[PDB]
Design a protein around this ligand. Structure first.
Ligand code: NAD
Ligand code: NAD
Ligand code: NAD
Ligand code: NAD
Ligand code: MG
Ligand code: MG
Ligand code: MG
Ligand code: MG
Lengths: 292, 292, 292, 292
C-alpha cells in the first residue's frame, strides 16, 4: 500500500493568518499535523528519558509524540503563552502510557535555560535524549529595520541557549545518550529577509559538529536536523512575511510544504541507539530543496 | 539498556590481509558484521519489493538483510566470484520468511545492467525500492600508476551503471517508490590515493540530487547514503593500501571503523514511506568524520 | 570611477538562437564579451607558459586573453569547426605582444588529449599554467531521452580528458606550476535537465581537490573555478533548452547573466604565484547564485 | 622565476610562546610576514577608500598594506592596546603615498562599532571598501571550562559587530562598494577546542551571503575570505592551546602554515571592481585544507 508522497499531506494554498509570536498552533488553519493520528512506535526508545525544547508545537511536538510512542518518558519546555498546546502534548504522551513533564520558561533567561536540564532529569528520573528544537524566527526584509534587540534575542534563543543547555547536560549524560539539534535549509541558503535567523541556523549546525567531536569520547552523540519549509506556528507568527504564506512550500520539488509529522522519523533514528555510527551529521527534510 | 557507541563494535587493530577484488567477506578477519544476528524489523517495508546491488556483502548486504527483516522481498546483484557470500544472503532473506532472488552479473556491461531491472521486476512481481550499493574502489597513491582502463572502469561501475539502472527503472516505478544511492565521505574529502573513486562518489551524489528533482513529480524519491570508514571487503581487496588497514577507522572521532550493520537503519529510513518529505538528501554515517 | 556591477554588463533579455554544438561565438547575438577591450595586465604572469582548453571562445577565451595580457605565452585547444573564433584569439594574444599557438583537436580522443600537453610544451618552450575549460553540455529534460552515447561523451570531454591531460602533464610541470579546472554552480545545485553534465561538474571539482593533495609535494597547485550563468556558445548550442534563453541569468541576485570577461580575474589570481597558499579550493563567479 | 609555494615560507616548528590577548605581533618569535617587503600594487584600487578592522596586525594588516599599495586610502581599526603594531601600519600606508587613518576602539561596544563607519568615511572623504577582519578566538578544550562571558564576547566581536558595522554602512555605501568579511576553515571543519569561535565563523559566512542577496540591488557586493592556519598573534594570545603551537600548520597538504602576506591577493581581488560578478562567495586560503 504505497502512497504518493507529493499528495500525502495538504497541498492547497494556506489561508493568510497571523498570530503574535510564538503562536498557538491549535489556532492555525489548518492545524499542523504532528503525527498525533499516524505515528506508530516499535519500542526503539524503550525506557529512554527525553527533554524536548519547543515540545508544545510544530517539529518539537512531533518529536515528543514519537518519542513517547517509541517508549520514552518526555519532558517538554515551551513558553507560558503556549500552555494550551503543551497540555495537548501532555495528554498525547500520557496516552502512550508514558510520563509527561511540563517545564515552561523562557530560554533567553540563562539561569532558566541552565536550570532546565536539572529540573527535567530530577522529574524524569534520568536523562538520555535531548532534542533541542525551540527557535525564534522573525522576517525583516530590509536591514535598516532589523534592530539590535531582535538580532541579539534571536542569537540568545537559538545559539546561546543551545550552549547553556548542552554545557549543563554533558556532565550528566550517560554513555549512549543522544543530542539532536535543529538547523535549517537557511544554514546553506540564507534568505535576505532572515539575516539574523539564518546566521543562527548556521551557528547551530557548526556548534553541534564541534560539540560532537568533543564529546564522542564520553559516548555521547550529537547530530543535527535541518528542515525545509514546514507548516508551523513559527511561520505564521512573524517567521514569514504575510504575502509568502499562501504558496508556502510550493517552490520545493515536491510542490508542497512539509508537515511536522514528517520530521519525527529522523528525530527517532538519531535518538535511537541504531544510529551508533552517526555523530556530527546533518539530516535534511526539505521536500527536495536540498542541503549543501 | 544503553551502550557506549564507541565500544559497541570491533575496536582492535585489523590484521593486514589482502584478497583479489571484489573479495569474499567470509575470508576476512574479522568478518564484517552486517546485522545478521542483531537487526530486528517492525514491518516498515511490508510487502515492498527491493533490488540491492552489492547485496552479497558489506553495506549492500546489511541493507538487503534489513529490508527482508522489515518485510520486503529482495533481489540482489553481485559478481559471480561472490556466489558464496550471495548464498549466505539468500538464506538470510529466506529465514525472514521473504523471497530472495539472486541475479549475478557485471554492472559494467551496459546490456546486463539495463536487463537487471527487468529481471528483478519479473522475479519479484514488481519493484519499488532500489538500493544501489555496488562499487569499485582501487587505491593508487601516484597518478603515474593510475591507468586509463582503471579510471574508466571505476566510472562504469559506479556512475554509468547508476544511470543505466535508474533510466530503465523510472518508467516502471510506482508512486511511492524509493531509490537510495551510495556516495562516501570521499565525495567531500577526496583522498589523494583515490582520484577516480572519490570523483565517482561526488558524481553519484550530484546525479542523485538532479534525478530526485526530475522524478519528484512522478512520486519517486531519490536519496543518498555517504558512509565513512566501514570495515568491508572493498577495503581489503585493493580499496586501501595495505599499511592503512591496521588503523583503519581509528582517526574518526569515535576511534573505530563502522560495521555494515550500522548502515542498515538509514537505508530502511529512506526506503520507508516514513521519509515522505525527504528527497535529494545525503545522509552521513561516518563516526564523526562528517560530511560537508 | 566606481561602477554599479548590476548594470556594468547587459541586463536585458536574449533572443532565442540555436547553433549546432559547439557553436561559433562570432555568430551569437549578442557576441559574448571576453574582455577584449577591457582587460589590463600588470605582468602577474610574465613569461609564464599556458595551455588553455576551450581557449577559442567563452570563459576559456577570457582566460587566454587575460593570460596574454598578464605576460604569458598561450597555447589554445578547441575543435576545428571553431577555427574562426580561434583565429580571433590568436590575433588578441599577439596584440598583447605574446606568442599564440593554436592546437585544434577533439579531447574525447585519448591519444589527442595526451599528445596536446607535449605539443603545447614543445611549441611554447615550457609549460607552467594549465587552464582546463573545455566542456560539453546538453540539456535533456526527461531521462528517457538521455542516451548512453551522450552520457558517456559528456564524461569523456569533461572528466576523462581532464584526467588524461593532467596525468600527462604532472611529470613535466615545474615547481610553481598552477592547474585551474572548471566546475559550475551545477556541482552544488544540479538541474534536472542536466543529469550527466552536472554530475561531471561535481566529478571535476572532486578530482581537482584530490589531485591537489597528491601533487602538493611536487610544488604544483590545483584549483577550481565554478561559474554561474555566463552568456556563451555552450548555452545556445544545446546547453540550455530554448525556452530558458530569453531570461538567462535574470534569476541571480544581480539580475543578469555574467559575461566571460568577468571570469578572467579569478583565472589570473589562481595562475599567479600570488595564490601560493591556495590549493584544492573552488571559486564561485555566479552573480550571487552562490556555491556551497 | 617560478617558486615552489610549499617552501616559499617557513615550514618548521614554532616556539611555544604566549601573550595576553589580543597580542602584539611585533613581539612574536617570529613576527608574521604581512607582505611589507613583497606586495606590489598595480593600481587596482586607485583612489578607493577602505576601512579595515583588525588592520594593525595579521591578516587585516596584510589587507591594509596591499590596499594602500593598490592605490587606496586606508583607515584601520584595532584595539588601542595594539598601538605598537598599528603605528607600523600607518607608516606602511603612508610610504605608498596614501592617507592613513588610525581609529582604535573596542568593537564589542555597539556605540563605538556604529560610530566607526562614520568616522572613517569622514576622515577618508568617502568609503567604498570594508574589510572586516577583527576577531576574537580563545581555545578551550573542554566545555566545562567555556564561560558564558567568553561565549558571548566571541559572538559580540565576531558576529554582532559585523552586523552593527554593516547595518550602519549600507545606507552610505555607493554603487560599486565591496564588503569583505572573514570566516575560516573552522566554519566547515569546527575543532572541539573552538566551540564558540567556530560557530561565529559559520555565522559570519552565512550572514555575509544573506546580506549579499539583500544588497545586490544597491550595487554593493559582499564576499567572504576563509583562511586556514595562518601564523598570527591571534594564535599565540590564546587562540590555540600551547601544545598546538609547535606543529601549527604542518597538517595541511602544503605542510606549513600560511603567512598573512598570502591572504592579501584575495582581499584585493574581492575589493577590486574586477570581481563584478562575484557576490555571496567564500574564498579559501588554506594550504590545501580546503573548504566545502
Ligand atoms: N517550520 C519551518 O519551516 C522550519 C524550517 C527549518 C527549521 N525550523 C526549525 O524548527 C524549530 C521548531 O520550530 P517549528 O517550525 O516547529 O515552529 P513552532 O513554533 O511550533 O516551534 C518553535 C518553538 O520555539 C519555542 N520557543 C521560541 N522562543 C522561545 C523562548 N524564548 N523560550 C523557550 N521556547 C521558545 C516555542 O516553544 C515554540 O513552540 C525551530 O528551531 C526552527 O528554526 C523550522
Ligand atoms: N567500506 C567503506 O569504507 C565505504 C565508505 C564509503 C562508501 N562505501 C561504498 O559502499 C558501497 C558498498 O561497498 P562496501 O564497502 O560495502 O564493500 P563490499 O565489497 O562488501 O561491496 C561492494 C560490492 O560491489 C559489487 N560490485 C563491484 N564491482 C561490481 C561489478 N562490476 N558488477 C556488479 N557488482 C559489482 C560487489 O558485489 C561487492 O560486493 C560502495 O559503493 C562503496 O563506494 C564504502
Ligand atoms: N556558460 C555557463 O553558464 C557556464 C556555467 C558554469 C560552467 N561553465 C563551464 O565553462 C566552461 C567553458 O564553456 P563556456 O560556457 O565558456 O562555453 P564555450 O562554448 O565558449 O566553451 C566550451 C569550449 O569547449 C570546447 N570543447 C567542447 N567539446 C570539445 C571537445 N570534444 N574537444 C575539444 N574541445 C571541446 C570548445 O572548444 C568550446 O569552445 C565549460 O567547462 C562549462 O562547463 C559554463
Ligand atoms: N590566523 C589564523 O589561523 C586564522 C584562520 C582563519 C581565520 N582567521 C581570522 O583572521 C582574522 C584576523 O585574525 P589574525 O589571525 O590575522 O590575527 P590578529 O591577532 O593579527 O588579528 C585579529 C585582530 O582582531 C582585532 N580585534 C580583536 N578583538 C577586538 C575588539 N574587541 N575590538 C576591535 N578589534 C578587535 C585586533 O585588532 C587584532 O589585531 C580573524 O577574524 C580570525 O578569525 C585567522
Ligand atoms: Mg509553540
Ligand atoms: Mg562482495
Ligand atoms: Mg567555442
Ligand atoms: Mg593585533
Amino acid at each position: 500500500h504505497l502512497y504518493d508522497p507529493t499528495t500525502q499531506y495538504y497541498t492547497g494554498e494556506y489561508p493568510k493568518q497571523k498570530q503574535p509570536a510564538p503562536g498557538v498552533q491549535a489556532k492555525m488553519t489548518p492545524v499542523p499535523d504532528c503525527g498525533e493520528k499516524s505515528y506508530v512506535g516499535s519500542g526503539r526508545l524503550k525506557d529512554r528519558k527525553a527533554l524536548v525544547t519547543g515540545g508544545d508545537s510544530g517539529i518539537g511536538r512531533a518529536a515528543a509524540i514519537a518519542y513517547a510512542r517509541e517508549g520514552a518518558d518526555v519532558a517538554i519546555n515551551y513558553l507560558p503563552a503556549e500552555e494550551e498546546d503543551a497540555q495537548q502534548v501532555k495528554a498525547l504522551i500520557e496516552e502512550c502510557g508514558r510520563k509527561a513533564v511540563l517545564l515552561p520558561g523562557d530560554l533567553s533567561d540563562e539561569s532558566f535555560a541552565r536550570s532546565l536540564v536539572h529540573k527535567a532529569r530530577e522529574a524524569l528520573g534520568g536523562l538520555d535524549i535531548l532534542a533541542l528544537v525551540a527557535g525564534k524566527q522573525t522576517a525583516i526584509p530590509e536591514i535598516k529595520d532589523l534592530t539590535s534587540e531582535q538580532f541579539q534575542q534571536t542569537f540568545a534563543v537559538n545559539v546561546f541557549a543551545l550552549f547553556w543547555i548542552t554545557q549543563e547536560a554533558i556532565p550528566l549524560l550517560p554513555k549512549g545518550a543522544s543530542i539532536i539539534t535543529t538547523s535549517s535549509i537557511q544554514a546553506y541558503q540564507p534568505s535576505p529577509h532572515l539575516l539574523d535567523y539564518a546566521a543562527t541556523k548556521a551557528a547551530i549546525l557548526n556548534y553541534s559538529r564541534g560539540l560532537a567531536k568533543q564529546v564522542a569520547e564520553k559516548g555521547i552523540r550529537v547530530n543535527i536536523v535541518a528542515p525545509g519549509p514546514i507548516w508551523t506556528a513559527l511561520q505564521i507568527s512573524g517567521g514569514q512575511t504575510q504575502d509568502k504564506i499562501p504558496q508556502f512550500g510550493q517552490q520545493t520539488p515536491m510542490k508542497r510544504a512539509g508537515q511536522p509529522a514528517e520530521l519525527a522519523p529522523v528525530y527517532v533514528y538519531l535518538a535511537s541507539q541504531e544510529s551508533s555510527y552517526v555523530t556530527a551529521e546533518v539530516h535534511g527534510v526539505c521536500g527536495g530543496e536540498h542541503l549543501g
